[PDB]
């Protein structure tokens, strides 16, 4: 509710915090499965696509020992029939990776597919209505705003640049993804403070998952747990312990 005087930075989680879980789980990711075949058929000749496929081919070789692993075989020739089979293998492999737990090869192709979806106006990133107005006010009040999500930074930029509220990239000072560390590790938050160029105690982290909130608290970061429609429930003790907010408007600077 009321932010300590020492906070100069607000760090924001995305899923379940600024954006509904339903958008991420039921729209953003399913889009990839629905579109990977068409995307590969359409853009196969693009240098970037050839590079993405090479990365997935290398990853497929590394995963060959796994039960259920889908190989991405060497081509038989270079005719449209050979291409059809190759594309089906890449498609099957992408779907298999997604069906299991998130390799760099998979994320790389996903980011390029989303670039087309968002840039062409096929999809918009959903934000809860209280987010943009509060953020604008926080910045007016001098707060810096950074994002921390397991979603790649490149994908995060697409979400803010094509939101249901228009292009809101200017509302963000910087982005962090798993390259700086995993969200349930306190060391990640110590590195985030270093990257931003502040102290851990200058940060207020808003997130919906308690395991992330507790990791951040262990790093001497201030935390508030955000409750949105569809979030995993909080235990009684958690509701008592953590400062809860159901809207960004509830934060007072
Ligand atoms: Mg979350
Ligand atoms: Mg430091
Ligand atoms: Mg302190």
Curated annotation (Swiss-Prot):
Cofactor: Mg(2+)
Chain residues that bind substrate: 149-150, 183
Keyword field contains Amino-acid biosynthesis: yes
EC numbers on record: 3.1.3.77
InterPro entries assigned: Enolase-ppase_E1, ENOPH1_eukaryotes, HAD-like_sf, HAD-SF_hydro_IA, HAD_sf
Associated pathway: Amino-acid biosynthesis; L-methionine biosynthesis via salvage pathway; L-methionine from S-methyl-5-thio-alpha-D-ribose 1-phosphate: step 3/6; Amino-acid biosynthesis; L-methionine biosynthesis via salvage pathway; L-methionine from S-methyl-5-thio-alpha-D-ribose 1-phosphate: step 4/6
Chain positions recorded as Mg(2+) binding sites: 13, 15, 208
Function: Bifunctional enzyme that catalyzes the enolization of 2,3-diketo-5-methylthiopentyl-1-phosphate (DK-MTP-1-P) into the intermediate 2-hydroxy-3-keto-5-methylthiopentenyl-1-phosphate (HK-MTPenyl-1-P), which is then dephosphorylated to form the acireductone 1,2-dihydroxy-3-keto-5-methylthiopentene (DHK-MTPene).
Molecular function as annotated in GO: acireductone synthase activity; magnesium ion binding
Keywords assigned by UniProt, alphabetized: Amino-acid biosynthesis, Cytoplasm, Hydrolase, Magnesium, Metal-binding, Methionine biosynthesis, Nucleus
PANTHER family listed in its UniProt record: ENOLASE-PHOSPHATASE E1
Magnesium is among the record's keywords: yes
Superkingdom to which the source organism belongs: Eukaryota
Family: Belongs to the HAD-like hydrolase superfamily. MasA/MtnC family.
GO cellular component: cytosol; nucleus
Binding note for cofactor: Binds 1 Mg(2+) ion per subunit.
Subunit: Monomer.
Catalytic reaction annotation: 5-methylsulfanyl-2,3-dioxopentyl phosphate + H2O = 1,2-dihydroxy-5-(methylsulfanyl)pent-1-en-3-one + phosphate
Compartments it resides in: Cytoplasm; Nucleus
GO-annotated biological processes: L-methionine salvage from methylthioadenosine
Record protein name field: Enolase-phosphatase E1
């Amino acid at each position: 509710l009321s932010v300590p005087a020492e906070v100069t930075v607000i760090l924001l989680d995305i899923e379940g915090t600024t954006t509904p879980i339903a958008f991420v789980k039921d729209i953003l990711f399913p889009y990839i499965e629905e579109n990977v075949k068409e995307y590969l058929q359409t853009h196969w000749e693009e240098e970037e696509c050839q590079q993405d496929v090479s990365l997935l081919r290398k990853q497929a070789e590394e995963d060959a020992h796994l039960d259920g692993a889908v190989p991405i075989p060497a081509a038989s020739g270079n005719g449209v029939d050979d291409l059809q089979q190759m594309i089906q293998a890449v498609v099957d492999n992408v779907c298999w990776q997604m069906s299991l737990d998130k390799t760099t090869a998979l994320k790389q192709l996903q980011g390029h597919m989303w670039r087309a979806a968002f840039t062409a106006g096929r999809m918009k990133a959903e934000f809860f209505a209280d987010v943009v107005p509060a953020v604008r006010k926080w910045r007016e009040a001098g707060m810096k705003v950074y994002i921390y999500s397991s979603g790649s930074v490149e994908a995060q930029k697409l979400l803010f640049g094509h939101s249901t509220e228009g292009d809101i990239l200017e509302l963000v000072d910087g982005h962090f993804d798993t390259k700086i560390g995993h969200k349930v590790e306190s060391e990640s938050y110590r590195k985030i403070a270093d990257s931003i160029g502040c102290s851990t105690n200058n940060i207020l982290f808003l997130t919906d998952v308690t395991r992330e909130a507790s990791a951040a608290e262990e790093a001497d970061v201030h935390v508030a747990v955000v409750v949105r429609p569809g979030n995993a429930g909080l235990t009684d003790d958690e509701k008592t312990y953590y400062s809860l907010i159901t809207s960004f408007s509830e934060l007072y600077l």
